[PDB]
Amino acid sequence: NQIDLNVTCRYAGVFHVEKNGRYSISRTEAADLCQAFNSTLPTMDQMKLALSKGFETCRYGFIEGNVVIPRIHPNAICAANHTGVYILVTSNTSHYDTYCFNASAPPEEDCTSVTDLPNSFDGPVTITIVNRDGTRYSKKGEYRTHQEDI
Ligand SMILES: C[C@@H](N)C(=O)N1CCCC[C@@H]1C
């Protein structure tokens, strides 16, 4: 009973979380997952500031109100070569990665590793935070509050 959460650097408190190496997070699960990191879904303004500090990914993820990809450099296979906060317009499907915003993180680029999941609750799952440099932090718990997400 295990969940892997791959996380990035934070940029003005915003970071990306990919669950189990595939698009697998619902909008309700995303809010609960950010809450376990003492974080919230970013606002579009928070995401635009993160972008300006150096944040980009090549994966769709929830923010408040939309599903987006922050892009700095044009790449043909990432958001159809767009730059800026690219907003997903048309999709049949509902499951993506998520972004999260931690207000207590540093104001600019923070590429230190994530070493805690401070607000998860009691439960049976082994949750492992996997950093880009491979360092890992694991704890037994749960973060999903909606049974349909379990
Ligand atoms: C200690 C710090 N690197 C950390 O582990 N966190 C803050 C950044 C967002 C997620 C997590 C709560």
Side-chain angles (χ1 to χ4, degrees), residues 15-108:
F15 60 109
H16 168 247
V17 185
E18 181 175 342
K19 177 185 187 193
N20 292 334
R22 63 197 170 264
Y23 286 124
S24 60
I25 310 174
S26 70
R27 179 166 286 283
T28 53
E29 182 158 349
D32 287 352
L33 177 58
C34 295
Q35 182 172 115
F37 285 109
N38 282 148
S39 297
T40 51
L41 293 182
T43 65
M44 181 60 81
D45 284 345
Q46 286 162 346
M47 176 63 79
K48 285 174 173 171
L49 191 64
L51 170 72
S52 82
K53 307 296 186 177
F55 191 39
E56 65 177 346
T57 79
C58 192
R59 300 277 296 172
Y60 289 110
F62 301 99
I63 60 165
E64 193 68 39
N66 286 103
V67 171
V68 304
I69 307 182
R71 293 302 304 161
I72 293 167
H73 303 93
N75 179 318
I77 70 168
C78 300
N81 212 51
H82 289 274
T83 73
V85 181
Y86 176 76
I87 302 174
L88 175 62
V89 180
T90 305
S91 175
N92 283 343
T93 61
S94 63
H95 282 48
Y96 298 100
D97 294 351
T98 197
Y99 297 97
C100 297
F101 167 67
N102 166 5
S104 298
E108 302 195 290

Side-chain angles (χ1 to χ4, degrees), residues 3-5 19-20 24-25 28-37 117 119-123 125 127 141-146 149-150:
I3 292 171
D4 276 337
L5 301 172
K19 177 185 187 193
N20 292 334
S24 60
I25 310 174
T28 53
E29 182 158 349
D32 287 352
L33 177 58
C34 295
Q35 182 172 115
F37 285 109
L117 181 66
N119 198 37
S120 55
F121 52 88
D122 182 81
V125 187
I127 305 162
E142 178 59 84
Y143 63 88
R144 297 166 293 177
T145 75
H146 297 265
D149 293 326
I150 305 174

Side-chain angles (χ1 to χ4, degrees), residues 103-131:
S104 298
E108 302 195 290
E109 174 182 75
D110 178 13
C111 285
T112 62
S113 51
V114 174
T115 63
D116 193 18
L117 181 66
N119 198 37
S120 55
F121 52 88
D122 182 81
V125 187
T126 295
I127 305 162
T128 302
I129 288 161
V130 186
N131 289 281

